[PDB]
């Protein structure tokens, strides 16, 4: 297996996470490694 990614408070203000990651109960499959997790806004 398990792992965490940790982000700073000021950085989270600038980032849009994908919903499957930010709201994990909605996820039904793996996320693909190297694919988008968060983008700058």
């Amino acid at each position: 297996x398990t792992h965490c990614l940790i982000f700073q408070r000021d950085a989270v203000k600038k980032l849009q996470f994908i919903p499957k990651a930010q709201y994990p109960e909605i996820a039904t499959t793996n996320l693909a490694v190297n694919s988008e997790l968060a983008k700058l806004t």
Binding site: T2, C4, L5, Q8
Partner: protein, 381 residues
């Protein structure tokens, strides 16, 4: 020079408290079905530590068995985890929880599982010819249609660019086919296999997924230190990052106060390597010794979500604070970086998948590029 299973036997038998716990953690497992059998339901449940040790010693020269080939409908949570199968119900007892939190027990388990890893990395399968390691995989059922289809399906579930065959997805040695289990020389090479070029393209986004993994939690506004043992397991940065034992990480704990923690789970049939989630300069890297089979009280017998048939599955937030794990802190406020400050990556072991292997490109002071392979989990301690 001593067999690490024998060192463990001596630890148990030469300490009165551990001797007590090593009986009580089995006595506290109910006699009645389904606990008369291990969680796979395929074998009787082990009821004493001597049988446990006998099996641990035997397992030192076994790869995990793909038991779903001949038993497709039984619980599959422990595919890959032969030690876990033996201790899964004991882990869920009050005495078992105490036993698997003992630092000396966990040093012994570390040494046993690392001896196991030596075998899993051995292309001879301990002296059975240059193909011994490969043959052990085939004998264990991994080249069956059931296993290969499972591995292919799991890889395809995360992408729209679906491939028909294992060989289009994962790198493996030359002349590999299903019949020779893709000529993987040993379990370790199969376990840490790489994707073929272009199968996992790096996205333009500032942050990409570091693992082929299933979202678990996303927590905002996390605290410096917290009561991670209470229901729901609030994250405790101070404990997770190891500021307990390394003052050098304490400034990074402070800098993550108010930040966000995202957590995701890697299944046994998923890719197990680690890829850089961001571009930046490594400013801190550590490995932290800890537990293997420690799970929550809620995950045990009488617990509100227990006993877990595949512990520590439902305890994943909890074990980020105590399990064998690693820490990487990347500074993205550098040339070529996304300028989103410091990003942390904390791989956390589960049971006998607890070898946290940082590749040399993550040495403190090096710059990693988003999408670079930077390490891997291995079966081991």
């Amino acid at each position: 020079v001593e067999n690490p299973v024998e060192t463990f036997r001596k630890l148990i038998e030469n300490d009165s408290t551990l001797y007590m716990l090593a009986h009580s953690m089995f006595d506290e497992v109910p006699e009645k079905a389904p606990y008369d059998r291990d969680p796979t339901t395929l074998k009787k449940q082990v009821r004493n530590y001597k049988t446990m040790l006998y099996l641990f010693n035997t397992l030192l020269t076994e790869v995990p068995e793909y038991f779903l080939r001949d038993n497709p409908n039984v619980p599959s949570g422990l595919i890959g985890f032969p030690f876990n199968i033996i201790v899964d119900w004991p882990m869920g007892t009050p005495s078992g929880r105490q036993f698997f939190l003992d630092t000396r027990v966990n040093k012994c388990l570390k040494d046993i599982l690392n001896k196991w890893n030596e075998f899993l990395k051995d292309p001879t399968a301990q002296g059975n010819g240059n193909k011994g390691g490969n043959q052990a995989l085939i004998d264990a059922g991994w080249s069956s249609d059931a296993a290969v289809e499972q591995l292919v399906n799991k890889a395809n579930e995360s992408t729209t660019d679906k491939k028909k065959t294992f060989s289009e997805i994962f790198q493996h040695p030359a002349n590999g086919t299903q019949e020779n289990f893709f000529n993987y020389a040993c379990w370790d090479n199969f376990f840490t296999r790489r994707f073929k070029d272009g199968v996992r393209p790096v996205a333009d986004a500032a942050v990409v997924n570091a693992c082929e993994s299933f979202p678990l939690s996303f927590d905002t506004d996390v605290s410096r230190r917290n009561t991670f043992w209470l229901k729901g397991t609030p994250y405790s940065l101070h404990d997770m990052l190891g500021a307990t034992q390394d003052e050098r990480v304490a400034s990074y704990v402070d800098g993550f106060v108010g930040g966000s923690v995202y957590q995701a789970f890697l299944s046994a049939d998923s890719y197990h390597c680690w890829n850089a989630p961001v571009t930046g300069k490594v400013v801190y890297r550590s490995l932290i010794d800890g537990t293997y089979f420690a799970e929550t009280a809620a995950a045990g017998f009488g617990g509100s979500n227990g006993p877990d048939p595949a512990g520590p599955d439902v305890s994943q937030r909890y074990i980020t604070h105590i399990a064998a794990r690693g820490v990487l802190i990347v500074d993205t406020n550098v040339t070529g970086g996304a300028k989103i400050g410091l990003v942390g990556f904390v791989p956390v072991g589960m049971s006998e998948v607890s070898t946290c292997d940082w590749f040399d490109n993550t040495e403190e002071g090096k710059t990693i590029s988003k999408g670079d392979v930077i390490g891997a989990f291995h079966s081991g301690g």
